[PDB]
Amino acid sequence: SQRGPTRMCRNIYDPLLCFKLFFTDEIISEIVKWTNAEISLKRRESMTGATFRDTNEDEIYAFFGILVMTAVRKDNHMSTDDLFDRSLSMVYVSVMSRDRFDFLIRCLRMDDKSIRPTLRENDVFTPVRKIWDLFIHQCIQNYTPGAHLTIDEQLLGFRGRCPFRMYIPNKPSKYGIKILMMCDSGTKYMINGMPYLGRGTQTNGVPLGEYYVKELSKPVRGSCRNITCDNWFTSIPLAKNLLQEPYKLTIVGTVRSNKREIPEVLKNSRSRPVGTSMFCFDGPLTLVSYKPKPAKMVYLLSSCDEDASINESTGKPQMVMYYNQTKGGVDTLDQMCSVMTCSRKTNRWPMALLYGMINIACINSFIIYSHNVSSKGEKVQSRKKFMRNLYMSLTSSFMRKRLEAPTLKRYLRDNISNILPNEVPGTSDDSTEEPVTKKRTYCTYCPSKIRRKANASCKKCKKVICREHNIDMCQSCF
Amino acid sequence: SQRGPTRMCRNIYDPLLCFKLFFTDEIISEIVKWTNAEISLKRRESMTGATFRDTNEDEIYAFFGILVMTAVRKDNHMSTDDLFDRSLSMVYVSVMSRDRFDFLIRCLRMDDKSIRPTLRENDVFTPVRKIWDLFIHQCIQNYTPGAHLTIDEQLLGFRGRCPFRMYIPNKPSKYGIKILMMCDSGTKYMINGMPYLGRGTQTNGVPLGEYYVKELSKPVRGSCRNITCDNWFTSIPLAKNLLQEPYKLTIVGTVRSNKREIPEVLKNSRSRPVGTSMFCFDGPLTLVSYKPKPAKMVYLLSSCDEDASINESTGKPQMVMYYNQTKGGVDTLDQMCSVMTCSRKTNRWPMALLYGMINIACINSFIIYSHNVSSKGEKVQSRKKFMRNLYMSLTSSFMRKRLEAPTLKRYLRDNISNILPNEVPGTSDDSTEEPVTKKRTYCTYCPSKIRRKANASCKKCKKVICREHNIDMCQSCF
DNA sequence: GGCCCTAGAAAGATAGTCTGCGTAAAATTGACGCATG
DNA sequence: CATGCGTCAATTTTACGCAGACTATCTTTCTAGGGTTAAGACTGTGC
DNA sequence: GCACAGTC
DNA sequence: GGCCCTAGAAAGATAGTCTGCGTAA
DNA sequence: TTACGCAGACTATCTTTCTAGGGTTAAGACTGTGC
DNA sequence: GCACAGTC
Ligand SMILES: [Ca+2]
Ligand SMILES: [Ca+2]
Ligand SMILES: [Ca+2]
Ligand SMILES: [Ca+2]
Ligand SMILES: [Zn+2]
Ligand SMILES: [Zn+2]
Ligand SMILES: [Zn+2]
Ligand SMILES: [Zn+2]
């Protein structure tokens, strides 16, 4: 059935359309509506001004563009009051002011507060639920997974208050929001996923290991693909349940040594030499264990990947070798995210989810992009370049309108005019001059607060001056 | 004797000098001459050019300036081939090119290769050692310690080859060079420290826990201070043997539950109600244990002469309260370092040590600086501004000389000219005479038929002129 | 609502700076005729 | 042609009122992040 | 029949 | 060198561009 | 009063190693209790 | 008188 982006999004060769595939217009439109609803409350009558207006689609895309660049650079835990510090960079200030950015980041909302009282008792995830579901839906519809899938967990660090955040001791960040997800091995496309949501998890009888494998697998349950799992999800009853009609999937993964189903023959005695392995069968399933170290034993379960052999080049059972090759399907995605991620400090947990969705979209967008382009036969650029182009495609239309203000400073105006593509169908000069070519109004060496107009410029440095200081040439020129 | 900078570094209000106190000429001179020795071995006749040149002190300081800014901007990754990408920023570009930076950093050496081969069987740390000892020496000499000191260890991440590389679980970074360290409490000034250097460390009878506390505390050995330390070091024989003619220091810290030092009355945790505590006296010193949780007990040792009882505001024994306040003296230093660290990927372990020394010099310089400024009675700026000022003080002389080349591009010339604080005219205080009095009264460039009043005096020749002929400057002046 | 601890960033507000435009007083400054040589 | 005096309404240069948009910097609240006596949630076995 | 200690 | 895996930066080298001074048309 | 060589510094981009970083069967090195 | 398994 092949692997790759589906027919619907196949002939796309640029980073913005590949991004819109995951976000869509419905998500951006919902963000704009609810954000405005919130902004309208946080506007006491002292706040009338440019920085405290409302939002639209162009601004939200530009905002995302800033988050995309934030991920490219490592400035994601850097103060916003430094990011927008001119002289270090004109990259962020050219899109919007630091105050507009701060106001908006505090006001983005993904839901309708008026209906919370009928949702919150049943769904602790309410404030991000509509967006999450639309997002995951897009992910599934844009791509056809290959032969092997990997299921594992991802933690979005977040130490603020959150009803379902949980501690995990062995992670880089230990106290955030747990998300379970499925990715295809070898490509790292995120296919599916869902929040853990604490102690809700209303499974019925089914333990969580099995429950989540069966739910995450839903899109692909009608055909045969493999599943690589952790020991949190791998078990004997799951290996057998997945082979019943409603699922055609099979499973490979390690198991815990304390499970009841493992025979004593595969347990670690001290008479068993180091480096040996043994196989036994539980019917259709093959259970294998081996001891790489004098006091350590590892167990693996493999269902449809049947038969048994040892790879003489390493001495390892072939089943573990297979496992080692597919087990990285989900953590590789996380590794790509930690290298290029935009996740900022915040005291509102639904933002943790929004930042996570932006990072996932950037990876999935890249995968589709890369695939479509290499299929066409053109060279594919790295993620770093994809992201730089994504930045411009998301912010250019906003910067273009920002320029309409007759009073948009000068240095902002000059930088925007030389950042934009200038993809104008037929633009040309009339007399070698730029289409704006305006002189500054005020005197270079005078305080701006006095608004003293400059009627002349310095021949030797082309600066605007007032007669009180100079007329033909400036005092700084000589 | 109080706490604070010593007599020699008592009145420094300039950040650059505060930095130089921990490097001095001996470290810079050794680095630059050994680096030149290395550069000459990396040349090929085909490489003759401006990039592959010998270093000098100004470049080395500028180079450290880049590393200081690197820490401010968190550019500890970020390929240098991106950091020096004009249009994102000119902050590094204006100091040196990316290829000069890559060549220079690659060639830095802190030692003499012709001597090393006869030193290496005795000291595995040879390639760093000379600089290291100079560095620590200055760290000890400046800044008198306070009444509370803390001893713990820090790990310099490094996964490359290193003979004494250590793996430590439960860390931010699993592998690296372990540094034993002593820091002042309250003010996190790094006083002393030393590499672990492998299992070959030779001690005589004394365990390492005990050994390191005695060596780290040497410079304060004859004064009474209260050392707070981890359970890797805390023990009865350490506590008993630090209150003798030599060594007059006390120890406070947690202990392991398996030491046969702890009586069975404390080593219980079964009949004891949760939240209660018990303690006893062994002699000069005391041991307390308490049971914060129904399945967990903690033991603490104090060799201070005290019975501090229980703090009623929490119910915790006062020894615990004390411990919690001073235990953070070393890890807080590591936290400050990781928030603004200058470190880069490298395959040469001595660089890991150099990067470590840069971060410590930056924090210790800040502490001396902060102290002197608040003592004077002036406001102290945060570390972020301190680092920005340090950057300019280290890179300015270099940039000033870089401008000497007639061919130093145009954008480099302009970005450098507008960042240098002293790029000013030799401006006078006043001007004795310009209009003079009434020399002509008519324009000397005007016909007798016009009799135009001369409304101006030539700026550079004081001639009687009409603005039409001589705008401000005369035609004979320019 | 959520283990001890810290440094420093977001949360949230207030006072100030950099750009454009328009009009009216102020600011000249460029001819205007009366002499000398 | 080179100078000289005292006159004016053209010219130009301020002064500042009509704002709009963006920015530096302050205090207070509270996450990000090191650290271990310290944090969840799960499965499967002893009393 | 409970609540008890071992791993993500 | 010294667990499994990957993605992407640093090693390390090559070919090319932006800048002024001396040549005159 | 505008073009061309010549030499000096800086710049983009390529391919081959091999560390930063994510895991979990996996990584040290010290201290005190098993035969 | 030797070899093993618990915490940074
Ligand atoms: Ca702000
Ligand atoms: Ca896992
Ligand atoms: Ca390079
Ligand atoms: Ca410690
Ligand atoms: Zn002026
Ligand atoms: Zn000028
Ligand atoms: Zn004239
Ligand atoms: Zn003149």
Side-chain angles (χ1 to χ4, degrees):
Chain A
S1 308
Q2 294 306 310
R3 174 178 70 191
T6 191
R7 175 180 59 81
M8 172 188 81
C9 71
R10 181 157 303 155
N11 292 322
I12 301 173
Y13 300 90
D14 70 89
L16 180 61
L17 291 173
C18 297
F19 185 75
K20 287 186 172 178
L21 294 170
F22 295 90
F23 271 101
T24 70
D25 297 284
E26 289 76 7
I27 286 165
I28 297 303
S29 187
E30 293 291 295
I31 292 167
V32 168
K33 286 187 300 194
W34 306 119
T35 302
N36 280 342
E38 185 76 350
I39 293 186
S40 300
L41 302 170
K42 303 184 176 289
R43 284 181 58 192
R44 66 176 84 258
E45 298 84 352
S46 57
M47 296 175 66
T48 305
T51 58
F52 307 112
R53 281 173 290 161
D54 46 22
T55 59
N56 53 37
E57 300 75 9
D58 292 346
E59 183 161 30
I60 297 302
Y61 285 116
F63 190 83
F64 281 17
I66 290 163
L67 300 181
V68 167
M69 180 62 87
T70 296
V72 173
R73 314 290 298 277
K74 298 302 185 171
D75 305 349
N76 50 17
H77 287 291
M78 185 178 299
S79 181
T80 60
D81 292 323
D82 294 318
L83 297 170
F84 292 85
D85 186 6
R86 289 171 302 141
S87 81
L88 292 176
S89 158
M90 286 304 281
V91 167
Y92 301 106
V93 295
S94 293
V95 178
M96 54 183 76
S97 66
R98 70 178 62 193
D99 302 88
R100 181 58 179 169
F101 185 83
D102 281 3
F103 180 67
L104 180 47
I105 200 166
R106 299 194 284 117
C107 311
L108 293 169
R109 301 286 181 276
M110 291 176 275
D111 195 26
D112 185 344
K113 290 175 157 180
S114 67
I115 64 176
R116 289 277 183 85
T118 64
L119 301 172
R120 79 201 166 179
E121 289 186 356
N122 297 320
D123 185 11
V124 74
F125 199 61
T126 300
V128 278
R129 166 70 66 185
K130 176 185 202 159
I131 302 309
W132 181 261
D133 294 343
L134 290 162
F135 180 75
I136 295 280
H137 178 74
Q138 285 309 112
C139 296
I140 292 164
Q141 296 302 309
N142 289 321
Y143 182 85
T144 296
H148 317 101
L149 309 179
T150 300
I151 297 177
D152 208 321
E153 63 185 36
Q154 177 176 48
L155 173 74
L156 306 179
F158 178 77
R159 301 208 58 196
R161 301 194 176 78
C162 170
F164 49 87
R165 73 182 182 86
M166 62 178 291
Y167 176 70
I168 296 171
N170 59 333
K171 290 186 175 297
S173 177
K174 282 160 212 205
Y175 293 97
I177 297 168
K178 204 187 138 157
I179 298 163
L180 298 165
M181 55 188 297
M182 180 172 75
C183 294
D184 51 345
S185 168
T187 295
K188 282 84 72 174
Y189 181 91
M190 179 185 177
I191 301 167
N192 200 0
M194 60 196 79
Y196 176 69
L197 307 184
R199 280 170 192 269
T201 68
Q202 181 66 47
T203 72
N204 299 294
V206 177
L208 300 174
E210 294 80 359
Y211 175 77
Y212 285 120
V213 168
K214 287 176 74 180
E215 288 307 295
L216 285 164
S217 299
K218 186 167 176 184
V220 293
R221 87 183 158 83
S223 60
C224 307
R225 289 180 169 84
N226 214 315
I227 300 174
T228 302
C229 300
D230 201 341
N231 67 30
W232 193 88
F233 308 89
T234 310
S235 74
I236 294 304
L238 174 62
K240 274 169 196 193
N241 289 337
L242 291 171
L243 303 176
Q244 300 308 305
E245 193 64 19
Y247 289 85
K248 306 290 183 183
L249 305 166
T250 189
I251 187 163
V252 174
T254 64
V255 302
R256 291 174 185 184
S257 72
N258 68 329
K259 287 181 83 70
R260 300 190 180 180
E261 292 83 357
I262 300 170
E264 292 84 356
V265 73
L266 297 179
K267 297 178 186 282
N268 193 12
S269 87
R270 295 299 172 271
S271 55
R272 170 162 174 186
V274 177
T276 56
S277 75
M278 292 185 70
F279 301 81
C280 53
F281 306 88
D282 293 321
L285 307 178
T286 302
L287 177 71
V288 53
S289 68
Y290 90 91
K291 63 183 290 173
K293 309 285 181 180
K296 298 188 177 168
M297 181 72 80
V298 50
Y299 300 87
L300 292 111
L301 174 65
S302 168
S303 50
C304 291
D305 297 321
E306 65 180 359
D307 200 339
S309 63
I310 300 165
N311 192 313
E312 74 271 24
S313 77
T314 68
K316 298 180 161 70
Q318 187 61 48
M319 310 191 161
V320 69
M321 292 171 78
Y322 171 76
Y323 166 78
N324 290 338
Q325 288 172 358
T326 61
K327 78 186 172 62
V330 172
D331 54 280
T332 302
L333 191 148
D334 188 68
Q335 180 181 322
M336 288 187 289
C337 294
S338 80
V339 171
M340 302 181 78
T341 174
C342 162
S343 176
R344 289 171 181 287
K345 166 182 197 291
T346 179
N347 68 340
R348 298 189 291 109
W349 79 259
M351 278 313 289
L353 269 290
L354 180 57
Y355 286 124
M357 288 187 279
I358 294 168
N359 293 333
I360 296 295
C362 300
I363 291 164
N364 280 0
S365 304
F366 180 75
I367 285 160
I368 286 153
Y369 171 83
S370 173
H371 188 90
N372 287 348
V373 171
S374 66
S375 181
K376 185 178 187 295
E378 292 174 8
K379 179 183 181 182
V380 179
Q381 72 273 33
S382 65
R383 288 178 65 240
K384 170 179 69 168
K385 294 289 189 182
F386 178 85
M387 302 276 294
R388 291 283 313 271
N389 287 324
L390 181 58
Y391 180 67
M392 279 309 299
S393 301
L394 288 164
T395 63
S396 197
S397 74
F398 183 71
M399 289 189 288
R400 168 76 62 185
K401 284 159 189 196
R402 167 167 210 215
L403 287 167
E404 286 177 359
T407 56
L408 190 75
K409 302 300 189 172
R410 184 75 166 192
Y411 50 88
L412 296 172
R413 214 180 167 60
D414 288 344
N415 278 274
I416 291 171
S417 289
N418 286 280
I419 291 168
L420 293 167
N422 196 39
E423 189 177 4
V424 184
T427 184
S428 60
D429 52 290
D430 295 298
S431 57
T432 75
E433 290 181 353
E434 295 186 357
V436 176
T437 314
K438 299 288 180 278
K439 306 295 186 183
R440 277 174 203 202
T441 302
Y442 304 115
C443 180
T444 297
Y445 305 95
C446 282
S448 74
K449 72 181 179 184
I450 63 166
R451 307 196 286 294
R452 182 181 296 174
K453 299 187 181 177
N455 298 327
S457 66
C458 163
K459 290 181 180 179
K460 290 185 187 277
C461 79
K462 304 303 192 290
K463 301 297 193 178
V464 300
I465 57 198
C466 72
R467 190 271 172 281
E468 184 183 69
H469 294 138
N470 323 279
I471 309 179
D472 45 358
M473 58 184 275
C474 73
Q475 73 279 38
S476 66
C477 283
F478 47 88
Chain B
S1 298
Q2 302 309 310
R3 173 182 65 189
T6 187
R7 185 179 59 83
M8 292 307 295
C9 74
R10 182 66 55 71
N11 291 287
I12 302 178
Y13 300 90
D14 180 335
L16 176 64
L17 301 173
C18 299
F19 182 76
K20 289 191 174 175
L21 292 166
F22 300 104
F23 277 93
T24 72
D25 293 339
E26 292 78 7
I27 288 162
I28 296 304
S29 183
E30 294 283 309
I31 294 171
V32 79
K33 76 182 180 188
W34 298 119
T35 296
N36 283 342
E38 183 68 15
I39 285 160
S40 58
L41 302 170
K42 294 300 162 164
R43 286 209 181 92
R44 298 190 180 180
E45 295 81 2
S46 59
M47 286 167 74
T48 300
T51 302
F52 310 107
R53 287 187 291 156
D54 297 344
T55 53
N56 55 40
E57 295 77 12
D58 294 341
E59 183 162 30
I60 294 293
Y61 284 114
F63 171 83
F64 279 111
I66 289 166
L67 294 178
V68 164
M69 182 57 73
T70 300
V72 173
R73 300 295 307 279
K74 313 192 173 304
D75 288 324
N76 291 307
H77 303 281
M78 293 293 290
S79 178
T80 59
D81 296 332
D82 301 319
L83 292 170
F84 289 82
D85 187 2
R86 297 188 296 109
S87 90
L88 294 178
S89 185
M90 289 297 294
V91 77
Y92 304 115
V93 178
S94 79
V95 180
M96 50 181 101
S97 71
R98 72 183 54 196
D99 288 340
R100 171 65 175 171
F101 185 80
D102 283 357
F103 181 73
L104 176 52
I105 200 158
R106 166 163 87 251
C107 304
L108 293 170
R109 299 292 185 279
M110 304 187 277
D111 193 24
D112 185 341
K113 293 172 151 185
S114 74
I115 295 170
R116 176 177 308 165
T118 63
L119 302 174
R120 71 192 159 161
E121 76 271 21
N122 297 309
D123 189 358
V124 74
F125 200 59
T126 298
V128 174
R129 168 72 67 191
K130 190 161 162 185
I131 300 313
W132 174 268
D133 293 347
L134 292 159
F135 184 72
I136 296 307
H137 180 74
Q138 291 300 106
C139 294
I140 295 182
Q141 184 65 54
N142 296 309
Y143 190 84
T144 300
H148 304 280
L149 308 167
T150 302
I151 293 179
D152 207 338
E153 53 90 22
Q154 293 181 352
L155 182 65
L156 304 177
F158 183 75
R159 276 168 181 88
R161 313 206 163 64
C162 181
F164 45 89
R165 195 189 78 190
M166 180 179 293
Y167 163 74
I168 304 172
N170 198 32
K171 292 284 190 186
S173 168
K174 286 175 173 70
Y175 308 85
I177 294 94
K178 176 165 197 189
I179 306 302
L180 289 300
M181 173 171 305
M182 180 170 72
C183 291
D184 199 50
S185 169
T187 297
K188 289 81 196 176
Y189 182 90
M190 199 284 279
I191 299 170
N192 203 355
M194 60 195 79
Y196 177 71
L197 306 181
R199 66 180 304 271
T201 298
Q202 180 74 65
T203 69
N204 297 293
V206 67
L208 290 175
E210 178 177 345
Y211 172 75
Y212 281 119
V213 168
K214 291 182 168 169
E215 291 303 302
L216 288 158
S217 68
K218 187 162 175 184
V220 295
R221 189 174 290 173
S223 310
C224 281
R225 324 201 170 245
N226 188 11
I227 293 164
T228 303
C229 53
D230 206 343
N231 67 20
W232 192 87
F233 308 88
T234 308
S235 71
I236 291 285
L238 171 65
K240 281 178 171 187
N241 290 322
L242 289 174
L243 299 167
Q244 310 282 326
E245 291 81 3
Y247 308 100
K248 292 185 171 87
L249 309 156
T250 61
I251 296 290
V252 177
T254 62
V255 301
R256 288 174 185 173
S257 79
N258 68 340
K259 292 186 186 298
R260 287 184 286 107
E261 297 173 347
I262 304 170
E264 64 282 357
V265 303
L266 301 179
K267 188 168 169 68
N268 179 252
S269 194
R270 169 65 185 83
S271 69
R272 183 175 304 185
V274 176
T276 62
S277 71
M278 169 180 182
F279 57 91
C280 68
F281 299 87
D282 298 301
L285 53 88
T286 183
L287 169 78
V288 54
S289 70
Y290 91 94
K291 186 175 166 169
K293 303 283 186 185
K296 180 76 179 183
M297 181 172 279
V298 54
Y299 308 85
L300 298 101
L301 170 64
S302 170
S303 79
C304 295
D305 184 356
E306 65 176 335
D307 185 339
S309 186
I310 300 165
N311 190 314
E312 77 269 27
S313 77
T314 66
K316 301 174 185 182
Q318 185 56 32
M319 291 167 59
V320 178
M321 302 291 292
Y322 170 83
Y323 172 73
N324 285 334
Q325 294 169 353
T326 61
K327 80 184 170 64
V330 175
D331 56 332
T332 299
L333 178 60
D334 191 67
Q335 178 182 328
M336 285 185 287
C337 292
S338 82
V339 170
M340 300 180 69
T341 186
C342 174
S343 182
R344 253 166 211 310
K345 164 185 201 299
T346 184
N347 59 179
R348 298 187 290 115
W349 75 261
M351 278 314 292
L353 272 289
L354 180 57
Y355 287 124
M357 289 187 279
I358 297 169
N359 291 338
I360 295 294
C362 303
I363 293 152
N364 277 357
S365 62
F366 181 71
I367 292 176
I368 296 299
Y369 171 83
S370 165
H371 189 91
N372 287 345
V373 168
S374 68
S375 177
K376 187 177 186 295
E378 291 178 7
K379 189 179 170 182
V380 176
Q381 77 269 33
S382 72
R383 285 179 69 244
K384 299 107 180 185
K385 288 180 187 173
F386 177 81
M387 291 292 83
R388 294 283 301 272
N389 289 333
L390 180 60
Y391 175 67
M392 278 317 293
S393 301
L394 288 164
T395 58
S396 173
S397 70
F398 186 71
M399 288 187 285
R400 169 67 60 189
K401 277 164 193 191
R402 168 174 204 211
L403 287 168
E404 290 180 352
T407 59
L408 190 82
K409 300 298 178 175
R410 189 70 180 180
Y411 46 87
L412 295 173
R413 184 171 311 278
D414 290 342
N415 280 278
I416 292 173
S417 303
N418 291 328
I419 199 167
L420 300 169
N422 53 354
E423 181 66 10
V424 299
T427 305
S428 69
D429 298 285
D430 207 337
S431 174
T432 303
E433 180 176 72
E434 292 180 13
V436 177
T437 59
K438 187 177 174 180
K439 278 175 73 174
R440 310 290 181 256
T441 39
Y442 288 147
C443 161
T444 63
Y445 296 77
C446 268
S448 64
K449 291 179 178 176
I450 303 307
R451 307 179 293 284
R452 180 84 58 78
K453 294 185 183 187
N455 61 305
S457 164
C458 176
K459 298 282 182 68
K460 282 186 187 178
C461 78
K462 314 294 190 280
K463 185 69 79 169
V464 175
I465 59 174
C466 80
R467 78 182 293 171
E468 185 178 0
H469 291 142
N470 314 274
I471 303 297
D472 195 58
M473 189 62 74
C474 86
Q475 291 302 320
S476 304
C477 295
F478 48 84

